[PDB]
Structure 1
Amino acid sequence: FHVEGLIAIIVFYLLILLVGIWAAWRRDIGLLVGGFTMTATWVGGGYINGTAEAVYVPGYGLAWAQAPIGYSLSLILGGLFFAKPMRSKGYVTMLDPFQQIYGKRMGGLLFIPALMGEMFWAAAIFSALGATISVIIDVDMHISVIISALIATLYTLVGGLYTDVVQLFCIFVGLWISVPFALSHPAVADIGFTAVHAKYQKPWLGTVDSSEVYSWLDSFLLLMLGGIPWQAYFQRVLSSSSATYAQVLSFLAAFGCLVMAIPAILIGAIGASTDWNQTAYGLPDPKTTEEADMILPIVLQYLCPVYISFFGLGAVSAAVMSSADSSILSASSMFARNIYQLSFRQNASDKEIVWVMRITVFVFGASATAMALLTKTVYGLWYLSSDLVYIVIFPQLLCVLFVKGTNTYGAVAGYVSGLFLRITGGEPYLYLQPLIFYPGYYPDDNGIYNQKFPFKTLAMVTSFLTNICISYLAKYLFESGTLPPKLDVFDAV
């Protein structure tokens, strides 16, 4: 349990770093590597445990595996539409549009939500690696996450003195070497049978009532429109010189997302359909014990033979550990650099980068660990990340680039309106009891009060409308008399 897991993880991390430096030492092909790396930005750590939750958990099923189909569609929406109206106007990074119209100050107030979103994502990755380690070396839930994240952040500490391709290859080989074998286990029954007929559990094929179809469309639109905005995607496409190449790149990344989601769904489906009274895990099921998180590492380690298991499971753990470094470094660096330049001015010569990035990266890792420690879901963290991004960033991104005449008053008005309409409406994974109680709430765990009336999409739309309304109203009273131009907090005249 302990020794085999530790040696497997160490060996595979050594081998992945070795291949990385083999690359870093030293056409007809350029569609391959770019598409694979840009889909490697999303896939990895996230999907496998997230969609494992989505499929395995009773009641939700496939029809509630929103993100594994949500993001791919998100990629197409980002490319097929926003590929054009940023090339022609010309922009270097997504930092630029906000700091071009909204002065310079407004940008940091806008990009704090991006920090919190990628903080959610980093917490999800840390939770996934904690579960994988807690299965491979079978220690604990508190111990695995803290050990994992401390090592990850202290390695990213001196990580400053391509590898994203080998991540996907390891992920693909690891899943596609276990599932053909686990599906053969006598403990498992026909994956088709429990899909439609519900022999040993509710059908792992998701079921949605006509009543909460509004909530289903809320979640779908949230994920689909909250994937586009984020920084890594814009940074990648903007660094691509030719436009059509970006469209084919979006096609290929969405296809990579969808193909890598195929082995991940079947893993959770087997985990659900399996008769657990035969395996050596004990009759207490992953739901009847508060450990539904670990369903994928559990099905790999226990429902596969000893020799096959460590290849795939160590590959998964090593890949997600590697992704942790990139996510942590990028998330801390962008905030520190942008907002520190923002505040009044600060010498970047020989203090800012090292000192500020150090402080921010350490505290960011600590906070990601702290919130990944209490939430026993990863699908929930995803939802929360894309949820906040959808609430705040996307409306103003869409009005800045697709709409004309947007101004700085609209930025603050949309910010306040969106944030209020979201936080006041309640959040069910944490204990955010709502204050409004939109028609359609159902009694639950007193932490979960879902309103079938979509308020997330309503908040997004009304924040965009608030931006437009206050912007053009202030533009209309631009004048003397009508709050004369003497009164001017953020410049528009």
Structure 2
Amino acid sequence: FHVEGLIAIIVFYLLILLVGIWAAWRTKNSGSAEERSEAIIVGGRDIGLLVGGFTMTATWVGGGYINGTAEAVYVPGYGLAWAQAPIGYSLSLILGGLFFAKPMRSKGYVTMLDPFQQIYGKRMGGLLFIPALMGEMFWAAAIFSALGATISVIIDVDMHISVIISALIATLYTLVGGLYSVAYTDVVQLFCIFVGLWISVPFALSHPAVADIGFTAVHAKYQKPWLGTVDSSEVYSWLDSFLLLMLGGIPWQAYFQRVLSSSSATYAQVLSFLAAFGCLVMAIPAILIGAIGASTDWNQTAYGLPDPKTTEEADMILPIVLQYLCPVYISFFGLGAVSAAVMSSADSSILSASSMFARNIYQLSFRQNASDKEIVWVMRITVFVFGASATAMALLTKTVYGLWYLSSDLVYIVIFPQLLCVLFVKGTNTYGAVAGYVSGLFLRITGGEPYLYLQPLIFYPGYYPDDNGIYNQKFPFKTLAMVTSFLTNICISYLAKYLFESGTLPPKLDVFDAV
């Protein structure tokens, strides 16, 4: 227990809160004097290029990303070949900038759910709200759990107090000011992440217990080489995971919040490209730390035998490396970097969920005659409630990671085909939307989730049991489910259009007014 690290982290938190409060004061008069609720969401559409790129990079680079890349490189049997997060993130951002985010910014939308509502109906727009909310909340809870574990590893401070304080600090400035405060804090937090991560690698590379990482990448010294390999029987699983990361990262409100706040559409394109480059730049020190951990004689350190992977502690390799192969102040620098990385994503997740709810459900479905003051108060109360709920789920649940993975798969399977259909396909109705929703939901539940101890209901070629007796799959059934959902959407939409436009079906049977 070192008091100096605690004092430093408290001072850092207070400085971040002060910056957020200052941003909220100075951006008070931006936007219309009557549309304050829409101001809190979009900022008046005046954000430049550098700020947009920095805030997008800070949003995408979180604790989970940094810890998972190092864990994937360190664990034997995975290597560098199975660290798919950086390339997937970069390709998703490049595809977004190339194809989406120009038509969305050209139409002056406020929230990602606006096209869905205006094309299908309020009921479909509200049905599409659940997966997005689940995806934001489970991701925030999982990264809060990871931050608590990291703090518990580095210092002996109780985890509950640390998690509560971090969540409270983020929620406070997100409540006081919205998008402007989030972006202005992200600008500082990205610099903190960069400096803290890059300062630690040379110190860890010079420890006497660490061997050459050029030799270890190709030859085995203490374990299997960390470059990894992909077997001929694991090509399809690799492609399935990569497609999940590359195509399921686009339909998120945490991305369209930055897209729709830009001055122009071309600026949105350029900010997406800059964010892709920033993610690629940030991915490097995590890989280096993972290689250092894989190339270390752990018997010569204070950790002692057995290895961290034998102790079932492979998810905490980065904090272990920082604590046991670096001096104390470098350890505190790394702790600050991880804290900043976690907060820069948690605040964006909470703001995105609150914006979606307050703008699209309450005002646009229940109270369509409410004043803006009511909407502002609803936004603030929603921010507080969602932050508290995320903190409670992080503290009192041990299955946060399985829920996070399942929610991400649900988002990728369901929302992405609907976005494609509304943007680029002409003639879609709500019949096809309902059909695609049902098909995507069914084809993912049928087929279990080992992390939640759920047995598969449909067995695909190549199923094998594991240690706990819960079956696994080797067939790319998630990509199949997504493609089936898209095709069902298109086919049912066009069939309904043909049946109602000219057919034996009377017009009175049009339950939804779409044709």
Give the TM-score of the pair, scaled to structure 1. Answer: 0.89
Return the alpha-carbon distance in structure 1 between the equivalents of residues 76 and 158 of structure 2: 25
Contact (CA 8 Å) 1:36, 1:253: kept in 2 or not? Answer: yes
1:184 to 195, 201, 206: 206
Counterpart-to-counterpart distance in 2, 1:288 and 1:202: 14
Deviation larger for 121-130 or 356-365: 356-365
- Partners of 1:473 and 1:398 lie apart in 2 by 19
Give 1:157 deviation, angstroms: 6.1
Contact 2:58 2:345 in 1 (8 A): no
My pick for the range that moved more, 34-43 or 462-471, is 34-43
The Cα of 1:310 is off from its aligned counterpart by 1.4
- The 8 Å contact of residues 131 and 297 in structure 1, kept in 2 or not, is answered as no
Distance 1:350 1:246 in 2: 28
Q: Give yes or no for the alignment of 1:386 onto 2:408.
A: yes
Is 1:304 aligned to 2:326, yes or no? yes
Unaligned runs of 5+ in 2: 26-44
Is the 1:56–1:204 contact (alpha carbons within 8 Å) kept by the matching residues of 2? Answer: yes
Q: 3-state DSSP class of the match of 1:453?
A: coil
Report % sequence identity.
100
> What does residue 14 of structure 1 align with?
14
Secondary structure, counterpart of 2:278 in structure 1: helix
Count residues in correspondence.
Answer: 492
CA drift at 1:342: 4.5
User: In 2, Cα distance between the equivalents of 1:356 and 1:84?
Assistant: 30
Once residues 267 and 229 of structure 1 are traced to their aligned partners in structure 2, the CA distance between those partners, rounded to angstroms, is 31
Describe the shift of the 1:470–1:384 C-alpha distance in structure 2 as closer, same or farther (beyond 3 A).
Answer: same
Question: Cα deviation per residue 1:13-65 (whole Å; 9 max; x = unaligned)?
Answer: 1233345556666x999543322222112113232112122222222222221
- The alpha-carbon deviation at position 365 of structure 1 amounts to 4.1
Aligned to 1:38: 56
Q: 1:246 to 1:184 in 2, by over 3 A?
A: same
- Correspondent of 1:417 among 439, 443, 460: 439
Indicate if the aligned counterparts of 2:444 and 2:478 stay in contact, CA closer than 8 A: yes
Where do residues 316-395 of structure 1 align in structure 2 (5 Å cutoff)? 316-321=338-343, 323-345=345-367, 348-349=370-371, 353=375, 357=379, 360-361=382-383, 364-365=386-387, 367-369=389-391, 372=394, 383-395=405-417
Asked if the contact 2:52–2:262 (Cα under 8 Å) also holds between the matched residues in 1, the reply is: no
RMSD (Å), alpha carbons: 3.2
Bigger drift between 444-453 and 372-381 goes to 372-381
Q: Quote the offset at 1:200 in angstroms.
A: 1.3
Quote the Cα distance in structure 1 between the aligned partners of 2:374 and 2:105.
32
Match of 2:296 in 1: 274
Task: Quote the offset at 1:447 in angstroms.
Answer: 6.8
Deviation of 1:341 after TM superposition, in Å, equals 2.9
User: How far, CA to CA, are the matches of 1:130 and 1:66 in structure 2?
Assistant: 25
Q: Which deviates more, 70-79 or 154-163?
A: 154-163
Deviation sequence 1:347-379 (CA, Å, 0-9, x none): 644885477556655554455446545887998
CA contact under 8 A between 1:152 and 1:324: conserved in structure 2? yes
Tell which deviates more after alignment, 192-201 or 16-25.
Answer: 16-25
Q: Residues 429 and 493 of structure 2 are in contact (CA less than 8 Å); yes or no, is this contact kept in structure 1?
A: yes
SS at match of 1:448: coil
Deviations 1:460-487 (A, max 9, x none): 1100111111111111210687332212
Q: 1:349 to 1:92 in 2, by over 3 A?
A: closer
SS of 2:300 mapped into structure 1:
coil
Deviation at 1:153, TM superposition (A): 5.0
CA deviation after TM superposition for structure 1 residue 328, in Å:
2.1
**Alpha-carbon spacing, 1:217–1:372, altered in 2? closer, same or farther (3 Å):** farther
- Asked if structure 2 preserves the Cα contact closer than 8 Å seen for 1:189 and 1:273, the reply is yes
> Using a 3 Å threshold, how does the CA distance of structure 1 residues 167 and 351 change in structure 2: closer, same or farther?
same
Shift in Å at residue 392 of structure 1?
A: 0.7
Distance between the aligned counterparts of 1:448 and 1:395, measured in 2?
30
> Residue 120 of structure 1 contacts residue 384 of structure 1 at CA under 8 Å; is this kept in 2?
no
| 1:476 to 1:63, Cα distance in 2 relative to 1, 3 A | same
Aligned CA distance change for structure 1 residues 221 and 360 (closer, same or farther; 3 Å): same
Matched residue, 1:135: 153
> Deviations 1:434-481 (Å, cap 9, x if unpaired)?
111111112213476442211111111100111111111111210687
Partners of 2:293 and 2:317 within 8 A in 1 = yes
- SS state of the match for residue 425, structure 1? coil
Equivalent pair of 1:44/1:168 in contact (CA under 8 Å): no
- Flag the 1:24–1:87 CA change in 2: closer, same or farther, 3 A: closer
**TM-aligned CA distance change 1:366 to 1:310, over 3 Å:** same
Distance 1:427 1:347, change over 3 A: farther
**CA pair 242-492 structure 1, distance change in 2 beyond 3 A:** same
C-alpha change, 1:351 and 1:86, in structure 2 (3 Å) is closer
C-alpha contact 2:46 2:262 (8 A) present in aligned 1:
no
Distance 1:141 1:258 in 2: 31
Conserved 8 A contact 1:443-1:449: yes
Structure 1 residues 329, 98: CA separation in 2 closer, same or farther (over 3 Å shift)?
same
Task: Quote the Cα distance in structure 1 between the aligned partners of 2:231 and 2:56.
Answer: 36
2:165 matches 1:151: no
Question: Contact 2:67–2:316 (CA<8 Å) still a contact in 1?
Answer: yes
Q: In the aligned structure 1, how far is the partner of 2:213 from the partner of 2:160?
A: 33
* Structure 1 unaligned regions, length at least 5: none
The 1:367/1:20 distance shift into structure 2, 3 A limit, reads closer
CA contact (8 A) 2:17 2:173 kept: no
Report if the CA contact (8 A) 1:12-1:318 is conserved.
Answer: no
Deviations 1:228-282 (A, max 9, x none): 1111222322332433333322221100000000111111221222222222234
2: CA distance, partners of 1:233 / 1:266: 28
Q: 1:417 offset after TM fit, Å?
A: 0.5
Deviation, structure 1 residue 433: 1.7
Name the stretch that deviates more: 40-49 or 234-243.
Answer: 234-243
Looking at structure 2, the residues matched to 282 and 275 of structure 1 have their Cα atoms a distance apart, in angstroms, of 9
Q: Measure how far apart 1:296 and its partner are.
A: 1.5
Q: 1:249 to 1:361 in 2, by over 3 A?
A: closer
Give, in angstroms, the shift of residue 320 of structure 1.
2.3
**TM-score, L = length of structure 2:** 0.86
Q: How far apart are the structure 1 equivalents of 2:388 and 2:13? A: 23
Segment drifting more, 9-18 vs 225-234: 9-18
User: Aligned partners of 1:346, 1:90: CA distance in 2, in Å?
Assistant: 20
Q: Deviations over 1:317-349 (max 9, x none)?
A: 245235433422332342244222344436644
